Amino acid sequence: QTPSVPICDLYPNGVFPKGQECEYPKKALDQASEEIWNDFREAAEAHRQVRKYVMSWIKPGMTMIEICEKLEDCSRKLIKENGLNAGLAFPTGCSLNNCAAHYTPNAGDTTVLQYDDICKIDFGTHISGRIIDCAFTVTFNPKYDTLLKAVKDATNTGIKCAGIDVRLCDVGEAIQEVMESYEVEIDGKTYQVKPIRNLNGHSIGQYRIHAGKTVPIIKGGEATRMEEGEVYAIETFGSTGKGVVHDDMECSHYMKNFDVGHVPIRLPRTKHLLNVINENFGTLAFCRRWLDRLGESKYLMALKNLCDLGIVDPYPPLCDIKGSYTAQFEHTILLRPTCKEVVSRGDDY
């Protein structure tokens, strides 16, 4: 690697590095899905190399647009983007401060990253719809160090507790216990770190970032169990605020409802936009910048139409109260028959 060389060109035999393998808190069965695990690994390796590169240049002074474009450019090159066979699984989240998730700049956003900002870089790659969903928090001021450590620890605790037959509610209880064991001091004020209760991890399906099961990050959830063969995004969020998020700011993220089938549309602009979405994203999430890049314009009303029709769903930024600070750490795990693989694990986090 120079990053510019596609992951597949770095591993000629098409065999990609495994992530961290763990015994749980069939070998034939495991091997029968090797092509699947392999695709996840190719996407995870791209994820590892992209984030390593990002960590080397992300600095206050850069615009959020500059950051996302530079990251996405690298991701496209390393994943060897190929329509729906290989590409970006979802938009680059770079949510700031009290905003925890689902913020990526739309065209014209002049927001500049600041020294005191706490930025959640949450981005995804896929090979054949096998998605790697993984994220980390970026800071420049050491005052947030303990908050970051709390969340990193909570995420690692959820990863450790996960396993075949494990009750999702137990994973959430564990995460909360660790998260809340931390106390931090920021600008002369102290806080007990709180998990964002209405935010959660979730199962992953083919071309489906949210397959239907959720991994709570607080006690009180469902006793539904994790199952052999499932794939999960284990993410946790810690906050100095209310520990609850609400929709806020302009929406940038959108995604077709996985269950909606074919819908004949005669309105020309709306029909065309749906065609563009089906061709380029299918059921994968996208953002407005990605429509712009494809040369689309005057699409906002068509997009609203699709949302109002329930064909597409909006995913607006999720933020805690003004003045609060939020952090995130996330990994994708495979519940293979023989072991638990933290496929996106790196030497970084």
- Active-site residues, by number, are 122, 133, 202, 210, 235, 330
Q: Are 314 and 21 in contact (CB under 8 A)?
A: no
Question: Which residues between 286 and 345 bind Zn ion (CB under 5 A)?
Answer: none
**How far is residue 175's CA from residue 199's CA, in Å, rounded to a whole number?**
13
CA 144 to chain centre: 21
Q: Does 246 count as an annotated binding residue?
A: no
Which among 45, 101, 80, 93 is positioned nearest to 236, based on CA atoms? 101
Give the DSSP H or E segment for 348: none
Residue with structure tokens 């959720």? 214
Cβ-proximal residues to 174 (8 Å cutoff; 6+ apart), any chain? 157, 158, 161
Does residue number 191 form part of the binding site for ligand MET (CB under 6 A)?
no
304-343 mask for ligand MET (x: CB under 6 A)?
Answer: -----------x----------------------------
**What one-character DSSP code corresponds to residue 292?**
H
Does residue number 87 form part of the binding site for ligand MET (CB under 6 A)?
no
123-136 burial, b at 16+ Cβ within 10 Å, e below that, comes to bbbbbbbbbbbbbb
From candidates 42, 133, 320, 341, binder to Zn ion by CB under 5 A: 133
Q: How far is the CB of 191 from Zn ion (least distance, A)?
A: 24
Nearer to ligand MET among residue 44 and residue 265 (C-beta): 44
Nearer to ligand MET among residue 280 and residue 338 (C-beta): 280
Does residue number 285 form part of the binding site for ligand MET (CB under 6 A)?
yes
Nearer to ligand MET among residue 7 and residue 121 (C-beta): 121
196-225 mask for ligand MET (x: CB under 6 A)?
Answer: -------------x----------------
Task: Report how far apart the first and last C-alpha atoms of the chain are (Å, whole number).
Answer: 21
Q: Are 220 and 261 in contact (CB under 8 A)?
A: no
From candidates 88, 94, 166, 233, binder to Zn ion by CB under 5 A: 233
Measured between alpha carbons, how far is residue 147 from residues 96, 161, 222, 299 in Å?
14, 21, 27, 40
From candidates 122, 170, 230, 320, binder to ligand MET by CB under 6 A: 122
**How far is residue 57's CA from residue 259's CA, in Å, rounded to a whole number?**
40
Residues near ligand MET (CB under 6 A):
90, 93, 102, 122, 124, 133, 209, 233, 235, 253, 255, 285, 315
Residues of the shown chain interacting with Zn ion in the complex, contacts defined by CB under 5 A: 122, 133, 135, 233, 235
* Residue ranges of the binding site for substrate: 102, 210
